[PDB]
Amino acid sequence: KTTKGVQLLRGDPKKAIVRLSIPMMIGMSVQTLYNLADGIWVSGLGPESLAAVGLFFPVFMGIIALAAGLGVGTSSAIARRIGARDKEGADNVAVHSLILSLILGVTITITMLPAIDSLFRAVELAIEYARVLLAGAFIIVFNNVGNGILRGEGDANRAMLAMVLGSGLNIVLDPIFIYTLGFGVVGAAYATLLSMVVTSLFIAYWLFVKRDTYVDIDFSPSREILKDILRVGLPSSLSQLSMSIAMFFLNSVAITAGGENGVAVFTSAWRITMLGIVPILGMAAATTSVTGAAYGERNVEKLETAYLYAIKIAFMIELAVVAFIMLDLISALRTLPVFLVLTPFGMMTSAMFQGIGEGEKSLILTIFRTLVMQVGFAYIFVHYTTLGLRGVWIGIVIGNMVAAIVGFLWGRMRISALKK
Numbered sequence: 001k002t003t004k005g006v007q008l009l010r011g012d013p014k015k016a017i018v019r020l021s022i023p024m025m026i027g028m029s030v031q032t033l034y035n036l037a038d039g040i041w042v043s044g045l046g047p048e049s050l051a052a053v054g055l056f057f058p059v060f061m062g063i064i065a066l067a068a069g070l071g072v073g074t075s076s077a078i079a080r081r082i083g084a085r086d087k088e089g090a091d092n093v094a095v096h097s098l099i100l101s102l103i104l105g106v107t108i109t110i111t112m113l114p115a116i117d118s119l120f121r122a123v124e125l126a127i128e129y130a131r132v133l134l135a136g137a138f139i140i141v142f143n144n145v146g147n148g149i150l151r152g153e154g155d156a157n158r159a160m161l162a163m164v165l166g167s168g169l170n171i172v173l174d175p176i177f178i179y180t181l182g183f184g185v186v187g188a189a190y191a192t193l194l195s196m197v198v199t200s201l202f203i204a205y206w207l208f209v210k211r212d213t214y215v216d217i218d219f220s221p222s223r224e225i226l227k228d229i230l231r232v233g234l235p236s237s238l239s240q241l242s243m244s245i246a247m248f249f250l251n252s253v254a255i256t257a258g259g260e261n262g263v264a265v266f267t268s269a270w271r272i273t274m275l276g277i278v279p280i281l282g283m284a285a286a287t288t289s290v291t292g293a294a295y296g297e298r299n300v301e302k303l304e305t306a307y308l309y310a311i312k313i314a315f316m317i318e319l320a321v322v323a324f325i326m327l328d329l330i331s332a333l334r335t336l337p338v339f340l341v342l343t344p345f346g347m348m349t350s351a352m353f354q355g356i357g358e359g360e361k362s363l364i365l366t367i368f369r370t371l372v373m374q375v376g377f378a379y380i381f382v383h384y385t386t387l388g389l390r391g392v393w394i395g396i397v398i399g400n401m402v403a404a405i406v407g408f409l410w411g412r413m414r415i416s417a418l419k420k
C-alpha cells in the first residue's frame with residue numbers, strides 16, 4: 001500500500017526536505033567528482049583530441065539536456081500524483097515516461113548518427129566519439145527516466161545508489177580505456193557507454209524485477225499525462241542548456257579580462273565551486289519532490305514550509321562550505337564563493353516551480369540567473385572597469401544577488417497566488 005519514500009512526502013515537510021536531500025547530495029558528489037576527473041584525463045591527451053571535444057560537446061550536452069529534463073518532468077509528475085493520493089495516475093506517468101524514453105532515445109540516435117558525419121566536417125576522433133555516444137542515447141535517457149521515477153517517489157537512497165554505482169564505475173573505467181587500453185578520447189565515451197549499460201541493468205532490476213517501487217509498472221495513453229511530463233521536461237532541458245552556454249560566455253569574459261593566464265584561473269575556480277554547490281543541487285532535487293507532493297495535497301502552507309525550510313538549511317550549509325573555502329586563484333577563492341550563499345535562494349525557487357508544474361517560470365528564472373545577471377554583470381565589470389580578472393568574480397557574486405532577490409520574491413508571490 002505505502003512505501004518509506006511516499007510516507008516521507010505525505011508527512012512532515014521539514015523532515016522530507018532533509019531525509020531526501022542527503023542521499024541526493026552524496027549521489028551528486030560522486031557525479032561532480034567524475035566531471036572533475038574526466039576533464040583531467042582528457043586534458044593532456046593533446047590539442048587535437050581537445051579540438052575533437054569541442055566538436056561533439058554541443059551535441060553531447062544536447063543529449064544530456066534532453067535526458068535530464070525528461071527525468072525532472074517524470075519526477076515532477078509522479079510527486080504530484082503521490083501527493084494527491086492518485087496511484088493509477090502515478091503508475092501511468094512511469095509507463096508513459098519509459099515509452100517516452102524509448103521514442104526520444106531512438107529518435108536522437110536515428111536523427112543524429114547518420115547526420116553527424118556531415119556536421120563535423122581531430123574530425124575523425126570526433127565522429128568516433130559521437131558514434132559511441134549516439135548509439136547508446138536510449139540508454140542515457142532510460143537511466144534519467146528510471147532516476148526520475150525513484151526521485152519522484154521518495155526513493156532518494158535507491159536514486160543515490162544509481163548515480164554512485166553510476167559515476168563510480170566511470171571514475172574507475174575512465175583511465176583504463178583512455179590510457180591502459182589506449183582508445184584515447186573515444187575511450188572516455190566508451191567508458192561512459194559501458195558504464196551506462198551496467199547501471200541500466202540495475203535500474204530495470206529494481207523497477208521491473210524487484211518491484212520495490214511504490215508505483216506498478218493501469219496504463220492508458222492520456223494526453224493529460226503527456227502534457228504534464230513535457231510541461232516540466234522541455235523547459236528543464238533548455239535550463240541545463242543555457243547553463244552550459246553561460247559557462248562558455250563567462251569563459252570568453254575570462255579571456256578578455258585576464259587572457260589565457262588567466263582562463264586557467266577561471267577553470268580552477270569553477271571546479272572547486274562545482275563541488276561547493278553540490279548541497280544546493282542535492283536539496284533542489286529534494287525540494288521538487290516535496291513541493292510537488294504538497295501541491296498534490298493542495299496544501300499551500302506545507303508547500304510554503306518546505307520551500308522556506310529548504311532555503312534556510314541550504315543557506316547555513318553554504319555558510320559552512322564557504323568557511324571551508326576561505327580557510328591568482330587564491331584571491332578569487334575569497335570573493336567568488338560568496339555567491340554560493342545567494343544561490344539557494346534562486347535554485348530552490350526554480351525547483352519548486354518544477355514541483356508545481358510550472359516549468360516555464362523555471363526556465364525564465366534560470367536564464368535571468370545564469371545568463372542575464374551572471375554573464376551580464378561579469379561582462380560589464382570587465383569591459384567598463386579598471387578591474388580585470390577580479391571584476392569577473394565580483395560580477396558573478398553581484399549578479400547572483402539580483403537573481404536571488406527576484407527569485408525569492410517571485411517564489412513567495414506565486415505561493416501567495418496559490419491561495420486566492
Ligand SMILES: CCn1cc(C(=O)O)c(=O)c2cc(Br)c(N3CCNCC3)cc21
Pocket residue numbers: 031143144146147162163164165166167169170191192193195196197199200203
Ligand atoms: C554509469 C552511468 N552513468 C555514466 C555517466 C557518465 O559516463 O558520464 C554519468 O554521467 C552518469 C550520470 C548519472 Br546522474 C547516472 N545515474 C543516475 C541516472 N540513472 C543511472 C545512474 C549514471 C551515469
